[PDB]
Amino acid sequence: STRSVSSSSYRRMFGGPGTASRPSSSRSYVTTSTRTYSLGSALRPSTSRSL
Amino acid sequence: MSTRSVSSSSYRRMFGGPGTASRPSSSRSYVTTSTRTYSLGSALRPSTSRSL
Numbered sequence: 001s002t003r004s005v006s007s008s009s010y011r012r013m014f015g016g017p018g019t020a021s022r023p024s025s026s027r028s029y030v031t032t033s034t035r036t037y038s039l040g041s042a043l044r045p046s047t048s049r050s051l
Numbered sequence: 052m053s054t055r056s057v058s059s060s061s062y063r064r065m066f067g068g069p070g071t072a073s074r075p076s077s078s079r080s081y082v083t084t085s086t087r088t089y090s091l092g093s094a095l096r097p098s099t100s101r102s103l
Contacts, residue, residue, distance in 0.1 A: 039103040040101065040103055041101050041102055041103005042101075042102060042103060043099075043101065044099055044100065044101015044102070044103065045097075045098055045099020045100040045101060046096075046098030046099065046100020046101070047095070047096050047097030047098025047099055047100070048096030048098050048100075049093065049094060049095055049096045049098075050090060050092050050093030050094070050095075050096050051088075051089070051090060051093035051094065
């Protein structure tokens with residue numbers, strides 16, 4: 001009676017490099033809508049008092 | 052005879068000469084040229100110099 005070759009997937013489906021999509025999203029670059037600030041210092045002249 | 056009259060002459064006898072009829076009208080109002088410490092507009096130069 002033939003001891004037939006029991007032929008399950010010992011050939012492939014393995015394995016080790018199952019480490020596919022590592023999260024490169026761990027590098028994000030978040031920044032706010034970075035302001036240049038306003039200043040009234042060029043709207044304000046010197047009102048000189050002549051005597 | 053003719054009267055040698057060294058008169059008060061008929062141009063100043065009745066006419067108060069040098070004299071109050073020559074009228075020293077000198078009311079001595081002193082012409083006080085009032086000196087103010089002010090150049091025109093010197094009180095306000097509105098200084099918009101705020102060079103920020």
